[PDB]
């Protein structure tokens, strides 16, 4: 096979990153670990805090939008009822 263009990701042994030195990682076999606890006592009061920060970024836009819809939605309802058959005939055509 022929060569190919230079990508920004190789493969095991030459992944294309910076030379690493001084970093030492340690890990233990999943077999020597407690039969999957974590949640409740350690990672139960840690969760949801990961949507306490973000919450305002979603909520406000969702707020602004739900209000806008609900609001103009009520105006439709009014316009197409006796109470607004006059307002309607005005703002229609």
């Amino acid at each position: 096979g022929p060569p190919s263009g230079k990508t920004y990701m190789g493969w095991w042994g030459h992944m294309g990153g910076p030379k690493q030195k001084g970093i030492t990682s340690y890990a233990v076999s999943p077999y020597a670990q407690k039969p999957l606890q974590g949640i409740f006592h350690n990672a139960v009061f840690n969760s949801f805090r990961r949507f306490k920060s973000q919450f305002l970024y979603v909520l406000i836009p969702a707020g602004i939008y739900w209000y806008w819809w609900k609001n103009g939605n009520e105006y439709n309802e009014f316009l197409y009822s006796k109470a607004g058959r006059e307002e309607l005939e005005r703002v229609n055509v």
Binding site: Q20, K21, T24, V28, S29, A32
Partner: peptide, 12 residues
Amino acid sequence: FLGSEVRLRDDT
């Protein structure tokens, strides 16, 4: 004994 690993990676 404990199933574990230590990786002293040195690219140099």
